[PDB]
Scaffold this motif. Structure first.
Motif, PDB file in Angstrom:
ATOM      1  N   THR A  92       0.845  -1.156   0.076  1.00  0.00           N
ATOM      2  CA  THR A  92      -0.041  -0.048   0.129  1.00  0.00           C
ATOM      3  C   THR A  92       0.834   1.319   0.252  1.00  0.00           C
ATOM      4  O   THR A  92       0.560   2.230  -0.844  1.00  0.00           O
ATOM      5  N   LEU A  93       1.851   1.331   0.933  1.00  0.00           N
ATOM      6  CA  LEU A  93       2.630   2.506   0.944  1.00  0.00           C
ATOM      7  C   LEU A  93       3.380   2.661  -0.268  1.00  0.00           C
ATOM      8  O   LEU A  93       3.654   3.828  -0.915  1.00  0.00           O
ATOM      9  N   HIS A  94       4.059   1.641  -1.049  1.00  0.00           N
ATOM     10  CA  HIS A  94       4.554   1.784  -2.481  1.00  0.00           C
ATOM     11  C   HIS A  94       3.529   2.430  -3.359  1.00  0.00           C
ATOM     12  O   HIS A  94       3.798   3.172  -4.190  1.00  0.00           O
ATOM     13  N   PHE A  95       2.227   1.840  -3.445  1.00  0.00           N
ATOM     14  CA  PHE A  95       1.222   2.229  -4.182  1.00  0.00           C
ATOM     15  C   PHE A  95       0.807   3.609  -4.169  1.00  0.00           C
ATOM     16  O   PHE A  95       0.583   4.550  -5.092  1.00  0.00           O
ATOM     17  N   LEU A  96       0.609   4.129  -2.832  1.00  0.00           N
ATOM     18  CA  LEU A  96       0.523   5.693  -2.611  1.00  0.00           C
ATOM     19  C   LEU A  96       1.739   6.411  -3.223  1.00  0.00           C
ATOM     20  O   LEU A  96       1.262   7.530  -3.759  1.00  0.00           O
ATOM     21  N   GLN A  97       2.969   5.898  -2.625  1.00  0.00           N
ATOM     22  CA  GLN A  97       4.005   6.728  -3.299  1.00  0.00           C
ATOM     23  C   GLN A  97       3.900   6.982  -4.977  1.00  0.00           C
ATOM     24  O   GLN A  97       4.166   7.977  -5.433  1.00  0.00           O
ATOM     25  N   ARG A  98       3.871   5.731  -5.495  1.00  0.00           N
ATOM     26  CA  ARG A  98       3.763   5.763  -7.193  1.00  0.00           C
ATOM     27  C   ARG A  98       2.559   6.661  -7.479  1.00  0.00           C
ATOM     28  O   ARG A  98       2.882   7.515  -8.472  1.00  0.00           O
ATOM     29  N   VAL A  99       1.445   6.768  -7.067  1.00  0.00           N
ATOM     30  CA  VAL A  99       0.197   7.529  -7.457  1.00  0.00           C
ATOM     31  C   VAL A  99       0.905   8.880  -7.150  1.00  0.00           C
ATOM     32  O   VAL A  99       0.458   9.864  -7.861  1.00  0.00           O
ATOM     33  N   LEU A 100       1.220   9.321  -6.048  1.00  0.00           N
ATOM     34  CA  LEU A 100       1.689  10.551  -5.452  1.00  0.00           C
ATOM     35  C   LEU A 100       2.639  11.279  -6.530  1.00  0.00           C
ATOM     36  O   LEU A 100       2.704  12.562  -6.686  1.00  0.00           O
ATOM     37  N   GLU A 101       3.623  10.408  -6.878  1.00  0.00           N
ATOM     38  CA  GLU A 101       4.897  10.701  -7.811  1.00  0.00           C
ATOM     39  C   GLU A 101       4.403  10.800  -9.255  1.00  0.00           C
ATOM     40  O   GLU A 101       5.009  11.286 -10.084  1.00  0.00           O
ATOM     41  N   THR A 102       3.269  10.455  -9.573  1.00  0.00           N
ATOM     42  CA  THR A 102       2.783  10.561 -10.970  1.00  0.00           C
ATOM     43  C   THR A 102       3.068  12.011 -11.495  1.00  0.00           C
ATOM     44  O   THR A 102       2.259  12.898 -10.765  1.00  0.00           O
TER      45      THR A 102
END
Length: 250
Positions: free
Chosen positions: A237-247
């Protein structure tokens, strides 16, 4: 104080940065099943809201009197608390909390991403149980957990009246799955004895999100947020949040 909140079933609120995570427990359950996730996301810096669903964390005789609109409202109230403090909001939840996660993504295009865990959209046995006319309570559904040393705070009986409410909610959310467009990280246990894993597989193939992934948890039963694969849920989940936020455009 007819139905006080059981120790450990209180809603949780963590003030962090401008990114909010709404975290929903499920049917007959409580925030005790979700607080490890909420604490981990708060430790990562996020603002976190874990609402207590109406009629939950008190007594199953209070639950018996609640509606699915009550449970939606509890989640909407937590969403509003986050909107007062956050410019970007994600939603995650276990089981009916995952159903409510999907409800929110179907209603609010602004939600940045969703993480349903063993989300419920179609349970044929519950459809039938909802129609029982002369049975008030069935057995507990809680504590389907592989690790034998872990316990869930959830009611000891399931109200038949409430089964009708979750059945109606699931039918509504299932019918609207094509309205989901935000990035989705879908967790499902391999051996879920409460919600058929095919539910999450159907969610994956019915939503319209361009970015979607399904992660199967091989060492957990239904209550995966407390079970052996909790660390996979938290870290992915933390990786997913980071990836979406960094898009970006790049």
């Amino acid at each position: 104080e007819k139905y006080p909140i059981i120790e450990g079933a209180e809603p949780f609120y963590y003030e962090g940065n401008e990114i909010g995570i709404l975290v929903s427990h499920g049917f007959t359950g409580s925030t005790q099943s979700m607080r490890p996730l909420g604490e981990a996301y708060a430790n990562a810096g996020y603002t976190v809201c874990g609402p207590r669903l109406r009629g939950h964390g008190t007594h199953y005789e209070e639950m018996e009197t609640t509606t699915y609109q009550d449970w939606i409202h509890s989640v909407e109230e937590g969403y509003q608390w986050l909107k007062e403090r956050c410019s970007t909001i994600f939603v995650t939840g276990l089981s009916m909390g995952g159903t409510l996660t999907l409800y929110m993504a179907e209603k609010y295009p602004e939600i940045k991403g969703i993480i349903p865990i063993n989300a419920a959209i179609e349970i044929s046995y519950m459809e039938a149980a909802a129609s029982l006319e002369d049975v008030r309570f069935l057995d507990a559904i809680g504590s389907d957990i592989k690790n034998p040393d872990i316990k869930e705070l959830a009611y000891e009986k399931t109200p038949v009246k409430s089964i009708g409410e979750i059945t109606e909610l699931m039918k509504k959310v299932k019918g609207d799955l094509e309205k989901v467009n935000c990035p989705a990280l879908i967790f499902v246990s391999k051996e879920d004895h409460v919600v058929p894993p095919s539910n999450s597989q159907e969610i994956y193939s019915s939503i319209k999100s361009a970015a979607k992934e399904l992660v199967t948890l091989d060492n957990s039963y239904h209550v995966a947020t407390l079970d052996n694969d909790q660390d996979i849920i938290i870290e992915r989940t933390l990786h997913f949040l980071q990836r979406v936020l960094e898009t970006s455009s790049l």
